[PDB]
């Protein structure tokens, strides 16, 4: 605290150019660290030598800036988070520089420098703050995944402990396989791993993972494997591996349960993000009403144009006289609808003429195609001057739509004039055809169903710019960190050209992008860990770097998808055909027939959008193939055919294959971006249309309130049905005191730590097995069983066995006890559920998350509209499963040809498995490509001698059928998501911020619990002793028994039925009165209307009139 001169004279240096120069310095540092040519070890080629010295200048300017800030602010620089981050970065940099100068791991902290750029730039701090704040309330949800990612993993340790040790090394350290087949053990019960290679040896070894990484031993490896499986990428590979290793049909249930739990968790996270976004899309947005401001702006524009037309009419209604007379006729003629129809027909005909190019290269007609184009200019000019003559000079020119048309036509005529002469790289025909596409924008003026969409697309870019910049900066920092960590260490002791590397900046950036997309990232991570950190205790430090790079990346992309949701918010602002019974049976809900009707009535608009996108593709393909891709399918079908393998699963495969003409017009790939991006918007816009359709399907079911209020009506109808309970407690006081004290936070914590160390005994079981650790875990298991028996004995007798089988959680722990006593009576595969019971005790931790279990109570109990969609999806599976049997019979299972014993189809359960695998999108393109007309299918039948060279297996129709199946399944799961989010809208997106009605319900449950006496008639001298604390949020304040004693004892009359008898229902009604607004005695109008309209229109209580016997003491 010192401000005579220096503090006053140093806080003045806060110029805008000062921050500009600081940002320029940061950008220069980022560029300097960008190249930093990596070397194996200390190669001073005069480049890194100078980059070493530049760091001195950067450090000194940063530290003088920090000193200025510290002097200016004193003990206020530190509390700010970003200032503290910058100070810590600077301290680390100066410390490492000093340590190096005194005499290289800390150099990676320099990579953290670009983050400081976001510390000062506006319009980015707010975005990052909103992003980090949105995910906080959902953090608890993420914790659940941890439990899951442990639980099932433990199951594997029980069932797949060292099941990959046995191999099929042919002679000595070499398996009898082409380095691809899993050397499954020569099991005593044959059927899997037969290893019939005419001379085989089955010996223990490591022939599982490509590097011995994802083996189920070494529990951390099991966790890595289950995490890799839970991301929906390559789980079929490990499923086939384990099925070949141990046997068929036994373990698939585990993976199916894992995948369905993962899907449910994804749904839950999406609903949580929905609630987080809705908490701000309406609140604080309807307040300022910026949408109303935009509506006012467009209304003002419309009114201005109308009044200007009025003024033009007024001036026109009265040398020059002939010109004025012709002005009226010119202004009247252009407004005729016949003229507009003729003009639009001419424009469409000309656009068809310029689009008549069918990729041919003739000469007799191409010349005819030339001159007419020039005439089109006249056809695109006559209106123009008329709009400059019929309408005002400054009126028509200023509309933000027709001005674009003027620019387009002027550019087109100038380009035509230019291409009339010679020009290198003309592109004139391309841009002329592109502006002919813009003629359809006039067609877009009519039928505004696309004009509104394109206006929303134009609007959304300004908001999405910040998010895309943040994502680009994020991938930049992560690419820099990846380049620093490896720096060309991808030797692998091999020669084959790896598809990715971290030696140069662009290749590292594209590798990071590919990892973020999740395509083949597992193999890249395996290679990265095997480069230096071989499987061991310190070798896993690399692996975590990948994991974060996915989640913190993907979530952001999902947040970008949430931004897309915000953009959406911006867009919202003949054999066995006897199965007809379900069609008649499912006609009861009637909640989806309207959905089908809306979909099949909007399919026309969907097809029109598909057609216009196909026309755009035709234009782009014509331009590209006429200008490039010169041969040393079709201009409107080749892109579609590529898209059949480029559905966002295969375009990364295209990049993967093309990373090896070569660079001749690679922009098509980026075109394959933009088009897909256009789809990724317009289809999303169609989905946004579907959103509106869902808003019409389910969002229009709000009907009329027909009650006193909107939320207080819900409170009244919720607090009038609440009834008091008793909660009987037995006579045993000592044992129940032991329950209250011992069986409490202490007991649950000790149970959690003991089961955790039990897992450390079983989850962390020794790799392979050792006799010492074996007997250690045996005796520890005996001790655990003993302590479990002791705890259940003290929880059984002390709980008054009469009351033992009453509570629901008591029955749950009773089931746990019965599992334990099964354990002690059997202490064995397929019966070792008791150990799972121990991991089932981990599920008990979820109970301790009562605050989150309500979420579960709203999901698993949400099975009200779920049965209808579930029946629809299972009948879809039935109809699409039984139909494939006869058409794909004799599937021709063969080893290592993508159709094998694991890929078998003739068996019904395996066919279901295959169709489920295709449903999730796990490389179903290969499945589609595995059924060709020329492929032989089980040449065992008598007329299969290939006499005519014909394979009796067409199967060239499953592509369209499976595409339709994928679309239907995606639409149905979207429908179920909409159903569940609508079911939980009055639960999650409610007023849960501070004073949500569910908080009132929880406090009602507290009232049912907070009064242990349960005497029914609680005295006024007794409620002050215990019921003094009523409710913090709803109550007036912490001035018990009543903060407003006068109001709460006069308006709510002091209850004195029997020595101050208070009724639970009467007290709840009093709390409602505190929430509602009715005055003291003499409120006959509002109070009597509320209490007598109960019979008719407020809360139907014609029966159970007991309220009209307890309220007259208080209210009636
Ligand atoms: C009482 O509250 C309702 C009321 C009336 C208006 O209803 C709105 C409620 C949210 C709702 C249904 C609306 C628009 C965008 C909808 C989202 C589009 C995204 O599409 C998905 C589907 C899966 C992905 C393919 C893309 O993301 C979802 C995550 C997202 C979505 C289905 C979540 C729910 C959203 C309309 C006032 O609310 C403003």
SS3 string, 463-521, reads HHHHHHHHHHHHHHHHHHHHHHHHCCCCCCCCCCCCCCCCCCHHHHHHHHHHHHHCCCH
Cis check for the bond before 446: say yes or no (omega within 30 of 0): no
Token pair for 65:
């800036």
Site to substitute for ligand 1 among 263, 271, 274, 555, most atoms within 8 A of C-beta: 274
Q: How many CB atoms lie within 10 A of CB 286?
A: 11
CB 909 within 8 A of CB 935: no
3-state secondary structure 280-316: HHCCCCCCCCHHHHHHHHHHHHHHHHHHHHHHHHHHH
- SS3 percent helix, strand, coil of the chain, rounded to 5, is 60, 0, 35
Query: Which residue, by CA, sits nearest to atom 6 of ligand 1?
Result: 699
CA distance 280 to 949: 67
Q: 702, 571, 722, 693: which is closest to 978 by C-alpha?
A: 693
Tokens 């297996």 locate to: 953
- Annotated ligand binding at 357? The verdict is no
Residue having the nearest C-alpha atom to atom 21 of ligand 1: 565
Best CA proximity match to 452, nearest among 701, 692, 697, 674 = 692
Provide φ and ψ at 261, rounded to 5°.
-65, -40
- Which of the 8 DSSP states describes residue 538? G
CB 251 within 8 A of CB 543: no
Structure tokens at 608: 């029109």
| Contact 686 CB / ligand 1 (< 6 Å) | no
Whole-number Cα distances in Å, 555 to 135, 265, 560: 10, 14, 8
SS3 166: strand
Q: What is the per-residue DSSP string for 612-662? A: HHHHHHHHHHHHHHHHS------TTTHHHHHHTT-SSSSHHHHHHHHT---
Helix (H, G, I), strand (E, B) or coil at 204: strand
Give, in words, the CATH class of 16-135. Answer: mainly alpha
Residue nearest to atom 25 of ligand 1 (CA): 974
Residues 214 and 229: their CA atoms lie apart, in Å, by: 11
Residue of minimum CA distance from atom 23 in ligand 1:
974
Is the Cβ atom of 282 under 6 angstroms away from ligand 1?
yes
Q: How many CB atoms lie within 10 A of CB 254?
A: 17
Count of Cβ atoms closer than 10 Å to residue 376 Cβ: 22
Ligand 1 proximity of 699 Cβ (cutoff 6 Å): yes
Closest CA to 81 of 123, 128, 114, 11: 128
Cβ atoms of residues 918 and 962 within 8 Å:
yes
Nearest CA to ligand 1 atom 30: 565
Q: Which residues contact 748 (CB under 8 A, 6 or more apart)?
A: 848
451: enclosing H helix or E strand? helix 451-486
- 211 with 498: CB under 8 angstroms? no
Residue among 245, 24, 239 nearest 117 (CA): 24
Distance from C-alpha of 877 to C-alpha of 915, rounded to nearest angstrom: 8
Please tell me the residue having the least CA distance from ligand 1 atom 29: 270
- Between CA 276 and CA 278, with CA 277 as vertex, the angle to 5 degrees is 95
Q: Which residue from 848, 912, 840, 906 is spatially nearest to 876, judged by alpha carbons?
A: 912
Alpha-carbon distance of 219 to 217, in angstroms, equals: 6
Ligand 1, atom 4: closest residue by C-alpha: 699
In angstroms, the CA 870 to CA 976 distance is: 9
192 three-state secondary structure: coil
How many angstroms is it from 689 CA to the middle of ligand 1?
A: 11
What the block records as the tokens of 530 is 């095997």
Q: Whose CA is nearest to atom 1 of ligand 1?
A: 985
Rounded Cα–Cα distance for residues 6 and 67 (Å)? 13
> Which residue's CA is the closest to the ligand 1 atom numbered 5?
699
Residue 138 alpha carbon to ligand 1 centre in Å: 18
* Length in residues, the chain: 1116
Rounded Cα distance between 234 and 181, Å, is 16
Bridge partners, residue 166, by sequence: 204
End-to-end alpha carbon distance in the chain: 66
Q: What is the DSSP letter of 439?
A: T
H or E stretch including 974? Answer: helix 958-983
| The pair of three-digit structure tokens given for residue 450, joined into one six-digit string | 């696309």
> Measured from the CB, is residue 974 less than 6 Å from ligand 1?
yes
Spacing, Cα 851 to ligand 1 middle (Å): 25
Q: State the virtual CA torsion across 589, 592, 593, 599 in degrees, nearest 10.
A: 180
- Nearest atom (ligand 1) to Cα of 978: 32
**Would the annotation count 189 as a binding residue?**
no
CB of residue 565 inside a 6 A radius of ligand 1: yes
Residue 734, CA atoms < 13 Å, CB-side half-sphere: 2
Q: How many CB atoms lie within 10 A of CB 1003?
A: 19
Listed in sequence order, the DSSP H helices in 335-450 are 337-354, 366-379, 382-389, 393-396, 402-419, 428-437, 440-445
DSSP secondary structure letter of residue 915: H
Q: Return all residues near 837 (Cβ < 8 A) that are at least 6 apart.
A: 816, 819, 820, 823
Our mutation pick for probing the ligand 1 site, out of 272, 981, 985, 988, counting the most ligand atoms within 8 A of Cβ, is 981
Q: Which residues contact 426 (CB under 8 A, 6 or more apart)?
A: 418, 419
**What gap in Å lies between CA 600 and CA 783, rounded to an integer?**
65
> Whose alpha carbon is nearest atom 2 of ligand 1?
985
Q: Which residues have C-beta within 8 Å of that of residue 676, sequence separation ≥ 6?
A: 643, 646, 648, 651
Q: Which atom of ligand 1 is nearest to the CA of 273?
A: 29
Give one DSSP letter per residue of 198-240, joined into a string: SS----B---SSTTS-S-SSSHHHHHHHHHHHHTTSSHHHHHH
Is 981 a pocket residue for ligand 1 (Cβ < 6 Å)?
A: yes
What residue owns the CA closest to ligand 1's atom 28?
270
Q: Which token pair is 971?
A: 């639409």
| SS3 (DSSP) at 1052 | coil
| Ligand 1 center to 691 CA (angstroms) | 6
Q: How far apart are CA 876 and CA 966, in angstroms?
A: 11
273 lines ligand 1 (CB under 6 A): no
Tokens 């909409």 — which residue?
978
Residue with tokens 């006496």: 1013
Query: Does 270 contact ligand 1 (Cβ within 6 A)?
Result: yes
Taking only Cα atoms into account, the Rg of the chain, rounded to an integer number of angstroms, comes to 37
Cβ of 559 closer than 6 Å to ligand 1, yes or no, is no
CA distance 999 to 991: 9
Residue 573 counted as an annotated binding residue: no
Q: Which residue has the tokens 């109808």?
A: 717
Q: Which of 384, 422, 379 is nearest to 405 (CA)?
A: 384
Contacts with 576 (C-beta within 8 Å, 6 or more apart), sequence order: 882
Q: Please list the residues that pair with 175 across neighbouring strands.
A: 169
Inter-CA distances, 572 with 269, 599, 691, 693, Å? 21, 19, 8, 11
Angle 672-673-677 from CA coordinates, rounded to 5°: 120
DSSP single-letter state for residue 206? -
| C-alpha–C-alpha distance, residues 48 and 29, integer Å | 14
Assess whether the C-beta atom of 996 lies below 6 angstroms from ligand 1: no
Three-state SS sequence of 236-281: HHHHHHHHHHHCCCCCHHHHHHHHHHHHHHHHHHHHHHHHHHHHHH
Token output for 851: 């605050």
Beta carbon of 137 within 6 Å of any ligand 1 atom: no
Stated in angstroms to one decimal place, the resolution of this structure is 3.4
Cβ 274 under 6 angstroms from ligand 1: yes
Report d(CA 933, CA 952) in Å as an integer.
8
Sort residue 830 into left (φ over 0), alpha (ψ -120 to 50) or beta. left
Pocket test for ligand 1, best of 562, 695, 698, 985 (most atoms within 8 A of CB): 695
The experimental technique behind this entry is: cryo-EM
Q: Whose CA is nearest to atom 3 of ligand 1?
A: 699
Q: Which of 566, 691, 991, 992 to mutate to test the pocket of ligand 1 (most atoms within 8 A of CB)?
A: 691
| Other beta carbons within 10 Å of 495 | 5
CA distance 1032 to 1071: 12
243 is written with which tokens?
């099925």
């Amino acid at each position: 605290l010192k401000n005579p001169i220096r503090r006053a004279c140093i806080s003045i240096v806060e110029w805008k150019p000062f921050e500009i120069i600081i940002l320029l310095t940061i950008f220069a540092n980022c560029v300097a660290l960008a190249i930093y040519i990596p070397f194996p070890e200390d190669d001073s080629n005069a480049t890194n030598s100078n980059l070493e010295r530049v760091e001195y200048l950067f450090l000194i300017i940063f530290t003088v800036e920090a000193f200025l800030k510290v002097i200016a602010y004193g003990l206020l620089f530190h509390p700010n988070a970003y200032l503290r981050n910058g100070w810590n970065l600077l301290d680390f940099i100066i410390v490492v520089v000093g340590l190096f100068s005194a005499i290289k791991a800390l150099r990676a902290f320099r990579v953290l420098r670009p983050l400081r750029l976001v510390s000062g730039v506006p319009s980015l701090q707010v975005v990052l703050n909103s992003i980090i704040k949105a995910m906080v309330p959902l953090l608890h949800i993420a914790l659940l995944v941890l439990f899951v990612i442990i639980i099932y993993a433990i199951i594997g340790l029980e069932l797949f402990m060292g099941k990959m040790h046995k191999t099929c090394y042919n002679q000595e350290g070499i398996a009898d396989v082409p380095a691809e087949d899993d050397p499954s053990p020569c099991a005593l019960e044959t059927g899997h791993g037969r290893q019939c290679q005419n001379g085989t040896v089955c010996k223990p070894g490591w022939d599982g993972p490509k590097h011995g990484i994802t083996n189920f031993d070494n529990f951390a490896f099991a966790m890595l494997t289950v995490f890799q499986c839970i991301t929906m990428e390559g789980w079929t590979d490990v499923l086939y591996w384990v099925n070949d290793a141990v046997g068929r049909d036994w373990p698939w249930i585990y993976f199916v349960t894992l995948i369905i739990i993962g899907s449910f968790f994804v749904l839950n996270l999406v609903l949580g993000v929905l609630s987080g976004e809705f908490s701000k899309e309406r609140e604080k947005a309807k307040a300022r009403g910026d949408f109303q401001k935009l509506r006012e702006k467009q209304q003002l524009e419309e009114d201005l144009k109308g009044y200007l037309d009025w003024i033009t009419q007024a001036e026109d209604i009265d040398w020059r006289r002939w010109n004025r007379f012709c002005r009226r006729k010119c202004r009247a003629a252009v407004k005729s609808n016949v003229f507009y129809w003729l003009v639009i027909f001419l424009v469409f005909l000309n656009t068809l003429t310029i689009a008549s190019e069918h990729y041919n290269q003739p000469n007799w007609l191409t010349e005819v195609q030339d001159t007419a184009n020039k005439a089109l200019l006249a056809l695109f000019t006559a209106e123009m001057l008329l709009k400059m003559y019929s309408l005002g000079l400054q009126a028509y020119f200023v509309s933000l739509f027709n001005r674009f048309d003027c620019f387009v036509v002027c550019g087109g005529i100038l380009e035509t004039i230019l291409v009339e002469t010679k020009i290198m790289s003309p592109l004139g025909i391309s841009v002329l055809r592109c502006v002919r596409l813009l003629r359809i924008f006039k067609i877009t003026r009519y039928w505004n169903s696309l004009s509104n969409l394109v206006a929303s697309l134009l609007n959304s870019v300004r908001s999405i710019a910040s998010l895309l910049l943040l994502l680009f900066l994020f991938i930049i920092i992560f690419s820099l960190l990846g380049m620093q960590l490896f720096g060309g260490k991808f030797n692998f002791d091999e020669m084959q050209t790896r598809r990715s590397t971290f030696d140069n900046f662009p290749q590292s950036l594209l590798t990071v992008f590919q990892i973020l997309t999740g395509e083949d990232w597992n193999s890249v991570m395996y290679d990265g860990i095997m480069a230096y950190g071989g499987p061991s205790f310190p070798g896993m430090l690399v692996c975590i770097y990948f994991i974060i790079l996915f989640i913190c990346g993907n979530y952001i992309l999902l947040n970008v998808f949430l931004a897309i949701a915000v953009d959406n918010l911006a867009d919202a602002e003949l054999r066995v055909l006897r199965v007809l019974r379900p069609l008649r049976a499912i006609n009861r809900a009637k909640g989806l027939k309207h959905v089908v009707q809306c979909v099949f009535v909007a399919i026309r608009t969907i097809g029109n959008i598909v057609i216009v996108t196909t026309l755009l593709q035709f234009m782009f393909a014509c331009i590209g193939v006429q200008l490039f891709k010169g041969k040393l399918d079709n201009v409107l079908a080749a892109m579609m055919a590529l898209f059949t393998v480029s559905t966002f699963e295969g375009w990364p495969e295209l990049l993967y294959r093309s990373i090896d003409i070569y660079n001749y017009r690679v922009e098509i790939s980026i075109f394959f971006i933009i088009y897909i991006i256009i789809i990724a918007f317009f289809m999303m816009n169609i989905f946004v249309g579907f959103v509106i359709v869902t808003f019409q399907e389910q969002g229009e079911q709000e009907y009329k309130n027909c009650e006193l209020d909107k939320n207080q009506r819900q409170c009244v109808e919720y607090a009038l049905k609440a009834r008091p309970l008793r909660r009987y407690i037995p006579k045993n006081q000592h044992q129940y005191k032991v329950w209250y004290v011992v069986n409490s936070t202490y007991f649950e914590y000790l149970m959690f730590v003991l089961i955790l160390l039990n897992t450390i005994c079983l989850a962390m079981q020794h790799y392979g097995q050792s006799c010492l650790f074996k007997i250690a875990m045996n005796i520890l298991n005996m001790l655990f069983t003993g302590l479990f028996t002791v705890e259940m004995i003290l929880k059984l007798i002390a709980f008054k066995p009469k009351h033992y089988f009453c509570d629901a959680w008591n029955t749950f722990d009773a089931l746990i006890v019965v599992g334990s006593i099964v354990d002690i009576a059997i202490t064995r595969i397929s019966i070792t559920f008791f150990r799972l019971f121990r991991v089932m005790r981990l599920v008990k931790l979820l109970s301790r998350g009562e605050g989150i279990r309500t979420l579960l109570w709203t999901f698993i109990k949400s099975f009200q509209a779920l049965p209808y969609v579930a029946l629809l999806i299972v009948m879809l599976f039935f109809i699409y499963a039984v139909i494939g049997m006869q058409v794909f019979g004799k599937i021709a299972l063969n080893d290592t040809t993508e159709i094998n014993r694991n890929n078998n189809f003739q068996t019904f359960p395996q066919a279901v498995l295959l169709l489920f695998r295709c449903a999730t999108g796990e490389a179903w393109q290969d499945i589609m490509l595995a059924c060709m007309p020329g492929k032989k299918c089980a040449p065992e039948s008598e007329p299969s001698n290939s006499t005519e060279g014909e394979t009796p297996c067409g199967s060239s129709f499953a592509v369209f059928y499976f595409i339709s199946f994928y679309m239907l399944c995606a639409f149905l799961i979207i429908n179920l998501f909409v159903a569940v989010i609508m079911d939980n809208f009055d639960y999650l997106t409610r007023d849960w911020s501070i004073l949500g009605p569910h908080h009132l319900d929880e406090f009602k449950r507290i009232w049912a619990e907070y009064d242990p006496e349960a005497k029914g008639r609680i005295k006024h001298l007794d409620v002050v002793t215990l019921l003094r604390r009523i409710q913090p949020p709803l109550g007036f304040g912490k001035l018990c028994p009543h903060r407003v004693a006068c109001k709460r004892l006069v308006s709510m009359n002091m209850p004195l039925n029997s020595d101050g008898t208070v009724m639970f229902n009467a007290t709840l009604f009093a709390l409602v009165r505190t929430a509602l607004r009715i005055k003291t005695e003499g409120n006959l109008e509002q109070a009597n209307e509320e209490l007598r309209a109960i019979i008719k229109k407020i809360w139907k209580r014609t029966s159970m009139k007991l309220l009209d016997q307890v309220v007259p003491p208080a209210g009636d």
